[PDB]
């Protein structure tokens, strides 16, 4: 009576009566005379809420009827798109075979359920599984004249699973109930996607703390390293997830791990200007002088992104203010290149050398005059940058400004007393470079001077 009433409530969608019966003590795995439990009956009738509630109360998802049909089989044969999606989201085997060899894809294809067919194909349903008759979903769709299903089956071909694994989708939505059901069914929290990222990576990306703690309590690798070397701590530091960084460090995240391009989590934090995360990583012992493949320290990445407070914090933690890359670029060089005069001001007011030479002998003043960064130019000249400094090729800042045609830079350089009659390794003047590039206004201003 109680089990019959529960199964009747499951069939009718009366969720309250079924929940009351389950509270009273009715076993959730009871089935009718045909082998159909409450999950099968709810899946037949499209009762998505009843399906979810029964899955939460630990019904056996892969229970088969007397014909061998799982709940996914019944949902696909009944064309319940939302129930099919919900069953797959909780870890239903899309390639299950019944007693006669039918798969959910076969049932969806024979019944012209195009949405179910598309969703099953997107979730790795193999359309080459034949029944005991040798029939495929394509063959039965051809026999029944289901033209759209035939076209979709042929066009899909063997594209495989293009949807994320169910644990990744649960981690994205912070949905701990689906994740708990999935981990009860499949005990592996480190399931890999096509890109090689675990669900912990997804949780770190969106700062889904609850599913992150649930995954870590089930044995997720806090230091998982894909082929590109991006650990979850890297993602948390890049995204600015302070709480996720704290959680990962508390569970044992390694502070010095490098990516494929040799970036530390401090590099990711400083590149995006996350001051609090950078301070947490430094207090946990992150190397402040660690370098990427091109020799960029975290202060270089902070200066490149105009992250003034991150530059200040790194300088406070004794970062080398004149560290060079492989191209011999100081943070002042990077600041002059990107036009960040505030970063340049903080660096020069903290003791950065204004006349540092790059690989081609370029000073920060040369780079500022190249890119028409006038404020960086004034800041450098005020903090004692040499206005007549030459490169390996003998290029003065006036040469660079005149060739690039930057009128404000040329005007300001001549106003401060830069000689326009200097020469290169070849005997070439700023007027030569202005005429060669056809900058009539710059050449005219040079000619009003003593050029």
């Amino acid at each position: 009576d109680a089990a019959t009433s529960f199964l009747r409530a499951a069939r009718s969608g009366n969720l309250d009566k079924a929940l009351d019966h389950l509270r009273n003590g009715v076993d959730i795995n009871t089935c009718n005379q045909n082998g159909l439990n409450g999950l099968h009956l709810a899946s037949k009738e499209g009762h998505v809420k009843m399906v979810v509630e029964l899955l939460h109360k630990e019904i056996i998802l892969e229970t088969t009827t007397k014909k061998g049909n799982t709940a996914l089989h019944i949902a696909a044969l009944a064309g319940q798109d939302e129930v099919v999606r919900e069953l797959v989201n909780y870890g239903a085997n899309v390639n299950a075979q019944s007693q006669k060899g039918f798969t959910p894809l076969y049932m969806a294809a024979q019944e012209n359920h195009l949405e179910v067919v598309k969703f099953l194909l997107e979730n790795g349903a193999n359309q080459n599984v034949a029944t005991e008759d040798g029939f495929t979903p394509l063959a039965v769709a051809l026999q029944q004249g289901h033209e759209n299903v035939v076209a979709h089956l042929i066009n899909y071909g063997t594209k495989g699973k293009v949807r994320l694994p169910a644990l990744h989708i649960a981690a994205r939505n912070d949905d701990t109930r689906t994740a708990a059901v999935l981990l009860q069914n499949d005990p592996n929290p480190d399931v890999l996607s096509k890109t090689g990222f675990t669900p912990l990576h997804i949780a770190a990306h969106y700062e889904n703390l609850n599913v992150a703690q649930l995954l870590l309590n089930r044995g997720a690798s806090v230091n998982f390293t894909p082929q590109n070397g991006i650990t979850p701590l890297h993602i948390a530091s890049r995204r600015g997830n302070v709480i996720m960084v704290r959680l990962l460090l508390d569970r044992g995240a390694q502070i010095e791990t490098k990516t494929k391009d040799e970036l530390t989590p401090l590099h990711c934090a400083a590149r995006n200007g996350h001051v609090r995360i950078s301070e947490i990583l430094l207090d946990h012992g992150a190397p402040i002088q660690a370098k990427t493949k091109n020799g960029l320290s975290p202060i270089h990445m902070a200066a490149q992104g105009d992250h003034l407070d991150c530059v200040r914090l790194l300088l406070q933690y004794d970062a080398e203010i004149d560290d060079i890359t492989l191209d011999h670029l100081t943070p002042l060089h990077v600041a002059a290149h990107c036009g960040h005069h505030r970063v340049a001001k903080v660096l020069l007011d903290k003791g950065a050398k204004p006349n540092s030479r790059a690989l081609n002998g370029f000073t920060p003043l040369h780079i500022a005059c190249k890119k028409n960064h006038v404020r960086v130019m004034e800041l450098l000249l005020k903090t004692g940058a040499s206005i007549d400094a030459v490169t390996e090729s003998g290029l003065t800042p006036l040469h660079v400004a005149s060739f690039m045609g930057h009128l404000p830079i040329v005007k300001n350089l001549l106003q401060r007393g830069a000689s326009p009659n200097v020469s290169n390794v070849k005997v070439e003047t700023p007027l030569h470079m202005a005429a060669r590039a056809g900058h009539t206004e710059v050449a005219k201003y040079l000619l009003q001077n003593k050029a």
Binding site: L164, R172, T195, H205, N228, I230, E262, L296
Partner: protein
């Protein structure tokens, strides 16, 4: 809408794998 992120291509775009790499160190050589 509201379900695009369930797919591997959308997740790959969202995770921004290029943001964990050293892009370049441009010089813009003046001579030619």
């Amino acid at each position: 809408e509201e379900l695009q992120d369930d797919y591997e291509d959308m997740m790959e775009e969202n995770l921004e794998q290029e943001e964990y790499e050293d892009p370049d160190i441009p010089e813009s050589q003046m001579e030619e």
